[PDB]
Amino acid sequence: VVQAPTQVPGFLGDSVTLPCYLQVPNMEVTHVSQLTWARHGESGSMAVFHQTQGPSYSESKRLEFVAARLGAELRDASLRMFGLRVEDEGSYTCLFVTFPQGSRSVDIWLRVLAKPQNTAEVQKVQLTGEPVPMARCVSTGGRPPAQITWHSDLGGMPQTSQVPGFLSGTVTVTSLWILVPSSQVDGKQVTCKVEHESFEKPQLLTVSLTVYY
């Protein structure tokens, strides 16, 4: 009966793969187990895979399955999936067919998208006053957008706003940056902690500033 962990990322480029497969329980063991994966998704009717008499493809002659039949197994196919575009999910399901009734298996669809790379720096003068003294700190290109914290020591800004990126290769590209007012401490420091569902840990970025004159 049907298993496949199935909660998996999932970043463009890309391009990778997803396991739908089975335990033999075990004082039972059967045929025939002939594969399919659908959408549901516009499940009318199938970004289909079947292997059974061979491998069969929708207008994805390419992509490329794993778990070569060429006989028996008894089957358990995860698809190696490259690639490499915004289907994510997909809400997909691998399916088997057998005489242990077992005419089926289970939907599912999991971790799904890509990241940026960011920059950030300070500028420019101070005529009091006041704000953005500042930092172009940016989220640039990433799928899961971040958002950034500033714990500039002074931190003196309920004031650090946003930009709905407008998307690079189709995604965020947003900047966000603090509106500190006037004064001195040139020439000190600030923090940009960029958050995000990747690179295990919130990178962050920091600089002195710019007294004036």
The domains located in the chain, with CATH, are 1-113 (2.60.40.10), 114-213 (2.60.40.10)
Q: Which residue has the tokens 């009318």?
A: 44
- Contact yes or no for 162/176 (Cβ under 8 A): yes
Q: Which residue has the tokens 């960029």?
A: 194
Resolution in angstroms comes to 3.5
- Contact yes or no for 104/97 (Cβ under 8 A): yes
185's tokens: 């401490």
* Interatomic CA distance for residues 213 and 198, integer angstroms: 41
* Interatomic CA distance for residues 91 and 108, integer angstroms: 5
Q: Give me the residues paired with residue 36 across strands.
A: 95
What was the experiment behind these coordinates?
A: X-ray
5's tokens: 């962990």
* Interatomic CA distance for residues 108 and 187, integer angstroms: 53
